[PDB]
Amino acid sequence: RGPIPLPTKRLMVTVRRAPSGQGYHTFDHWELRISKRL
């Protein structure tokens, strides 16, 4: 009939911010949002 906003596909990768775990445990939120219409 018309456009329809199907719910977006969200992709998460929480990754530790350290190349050897020295220090506080800081984490990186990596996001790749996908929108789908119809």
């Binding site: 992709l11 990768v13 990754v15 530790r16 911010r17 190349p19 990186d28 990596w30």
Partner: peptide
């Protein structure tokens, strides 16, 4: 093992991404 090197440590198989978790922060964008 990885994709931008071979390291085996943090292999990651989330989805289908094969990266060492150190390279991935550098190749994420």
């Amino acid at each position: 093992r990885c994709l931008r090197c071979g390291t085996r440590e943090a292999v990651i198989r989330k989805y289908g991404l094969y990266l060492c978790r150190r390279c991935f922060r550098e190749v994420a964008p």
